[PDB]
Amino acid sequence: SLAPYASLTEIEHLVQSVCKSYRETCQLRLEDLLRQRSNIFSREEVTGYQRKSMWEMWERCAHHLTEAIQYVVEFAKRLSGFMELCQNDQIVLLKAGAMEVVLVRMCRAYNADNRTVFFEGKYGGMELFRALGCSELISSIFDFSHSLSALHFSEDEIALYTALVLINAHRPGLQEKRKVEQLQYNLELAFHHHLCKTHRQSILAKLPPKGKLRSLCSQHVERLQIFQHLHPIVVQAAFPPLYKELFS
Amino acid sequence: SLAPYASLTEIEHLVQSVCKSYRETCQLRLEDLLRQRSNIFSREEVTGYQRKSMWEMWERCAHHLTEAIQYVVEFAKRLSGFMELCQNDQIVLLKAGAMEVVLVRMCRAYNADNRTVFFEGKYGGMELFRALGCSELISSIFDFSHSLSALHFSEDEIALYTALVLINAHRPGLQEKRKVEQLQYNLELAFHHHLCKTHRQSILAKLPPKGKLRSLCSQHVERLQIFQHLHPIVVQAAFPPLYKELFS
């Protein structure tokens, strides 16, 4: 909501609204990800992924990331207040934040018991991604999901925290910074109210720093520039156009 | 090869060449596909696929089909004679035949014993594809793979037969039909020579009539037009550009 001086009733309604927008666009139900924890890639399947060409593995990951971003775009379209921002600001917020929201949501698909992530129907470790040729970035993404796994978020906490990762009034290029600041503040009141009622405000000091998410996004953009030099026709022929627009 | 009056030595060399081009671009190893036959999607996994949105299921299948087409383009680039045809004819042959070659190659991933296909890491029946909204086309594709299954092709037979599905001198729009006729004839000599040496010429009268492959391709183009009317932004945002160019 963009309402100035939002009352306690409005903040409680905003907590409910944000949680419902997230539930309708969460992509996979948490119970489905948990039910599949015993479905792990066999050693022969891992060898098969590691044998794939770099272009084939980049194309698969770009497709899966694009599908996850499509759900974040729908989350934004349903998020209280987002469609009241100007067209430019909506685009500036999604271009800088859709990838960051996906990286946060991905902690639900990470199993700390065996350090594996749900990918293409089964759970696999970072070794599954070897053919991409960006081991440092993959290892950093697994470490980031591991840091969020340790905070043990509920679905409601993910909904309120991802709304704030997206509604960031400090993004360069915003034209109505003051309007985004009001929406960000109301979402912060909603997140803090939910955390206070459930005795979870102690997680605020444990959230990843202002810089961790930007580093992962900047590394992705850098590795894609290296990939596009080695395979300049694969991107224009097979990658999703939304992916090329956001990261090229 | 486009060489006129190909000798028996040239025909034997062309059999070896076509089999090698196919082996280098077959996408998945036959032994991996066969050894995964007993791994079938559970009833809960099937329900999960059937609960996906139409746009998500179409986008996934367009991606998998595009990856399979990319291997057929590399098969064509390595196929003896293909790169000696004019640029227009190469495009006419791939635009009409890439999808037909993929449909033939997919008989390797089909189990006639339980009517399942290898898809996204496990085997599943036609019910897995229900969210696409084109049950009749999916049933026709499963029937086509079932008709090829009955011939129990070797890998060498698939290589020689798929070369002929692609090098078809009757495709409308060819500008140098005489060169395509010559290349088609040499590939037919190579296919017939291989079949004669292995006592398999009896399969020639059992190959599917050309109209069958034409019908599957035409139905796919029609179902994509129906999909694009219901979801006009999904295609331009997320589908592979090669897919939109070949079928839109």
């Binding site: 499509q70 775009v73 379209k77 067209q87 909506q90 685009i91 999604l94 271009k95 156009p241 939304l242 627009e245 956001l246 | 006009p232 932004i233 331009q236 945002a237």
Partner: peptide, 11 residues
């Protein structure tokens, strides 16, 4: 930003 714009106006 042609694609993001179209996704935002799609209903």
């Amino acid at each position: 930003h042609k694609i993001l714009h179209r996704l935002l106006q799609d209903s």
